[PDB]
Design an enzyme around this catalytic site. Sequence first.
Site, PDB file in Angstrom:
ATOM      1  N   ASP A  34       0.828  -1.204   0.000  1.00 39.92           N
ATOM      2  CA  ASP A  34       0.000   0.000   0.000  1.00 39.92           C
ATOM      3  C   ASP A  34       0.867   1.260   0.000  1.00 39.92           C
ATOM      4  OD1 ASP A  34      -1.938   1.899   0.279  1.00 39.92           O
ATOM      5  OD2 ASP A  34      -2.418   1.415   2.383  1.00 39.92           O
ATOM      6  N   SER A  78      -0.654  15.777 -11.896  1.00 37.13           N
ATOM      7  CA  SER A  78      -0.913  15.420 -13.279  1.00 37.13           C
ATOM      8  C   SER A  78      -1.152  16.691 -14.084  1.00 37.13           C
ATOM      9  CB  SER A  78      -2.125  14.487 -13.356  1.00 37.13           C
ATOM     10  OG  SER A  78      -2.555  14.269 -14.681  1.00 37.13           O
TER      11      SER A  78
END
Length: 330
Positions: free
Chosen positions: A35, A199
């Site tokens: 994770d 992004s």
Amino acid sequence: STGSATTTPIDSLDDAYITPVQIGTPAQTLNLDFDTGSSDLWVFSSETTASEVDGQTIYTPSKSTTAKLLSGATWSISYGDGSSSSGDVYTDTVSVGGLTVTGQAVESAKKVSSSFTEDSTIDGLLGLAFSTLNTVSPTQQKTFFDNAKASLDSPVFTADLGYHAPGTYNFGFIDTTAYTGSITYTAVSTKQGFWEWTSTGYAVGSGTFKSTSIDGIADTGTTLLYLPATVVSAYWAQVSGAKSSSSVGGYVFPCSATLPSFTFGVGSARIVIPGDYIDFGPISTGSSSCFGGIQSSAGIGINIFGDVALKAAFVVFNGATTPTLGFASK
């Protein structure tokens, strides 16, 4: 040193991925959920409340000659999905894919929430976010990656998740045969303890690319792609009959639909998520309403590039002094 381990989807929907991990001496192999959005290595154990164990493999520290109680240390964690676990702590030898760390904090669960009990395939979590998020008190502990780092040939790990197929976690090297083209690297902020990046925009299907900054985290422990409501609405508007359902808990779409792809930007590079990756199947057995793999982050407080996005790429988690993230197509 290096390590290389295969990671395998837990079910037919790629809800999560499990990777075998050797703990203790002789080895006890547990299948852990790696994770990159948390920083605790915790396991089902001989200390876990018996009624909360249902099919998981447990770590038994009393059977390990190298286990030592970390006296006084406790831990307690809550995850974004509302699940939780807590317990005490041992140090022991932990190996992943041939890479061994001695003195790793292995957090033994005394209690786990229902979601963990009900998932027999996951024996615990191995956190790969920054150690500043580790929950052990009163002495915070380091992640497996942090402990391994100095011994690694290069201070990196890579995630190569499969679509309905096994993939690979590598430690200490970049497998140049595992991706196509070049890797595009982008800056990381560690201010919140995550692999947080920005992004450069998105496209829906064959549509034009929208240049816009989207801050979010690369999180292998989250199944879906969670993005701003504006972006998500633009995506689902291209699917006839798709709608957000408060009763179901997100966007659903007719199972008869063909889903468009979704592209996200990494610098000037583009990663394309095929439409099929965005199909999470019937909301309930036999239903003709299907659950979407792109959902709104509104009310989470952070955008999350979960498995839906990451499995479309070869992803480099560069833990050098100035951390960065790299993405390549594959």
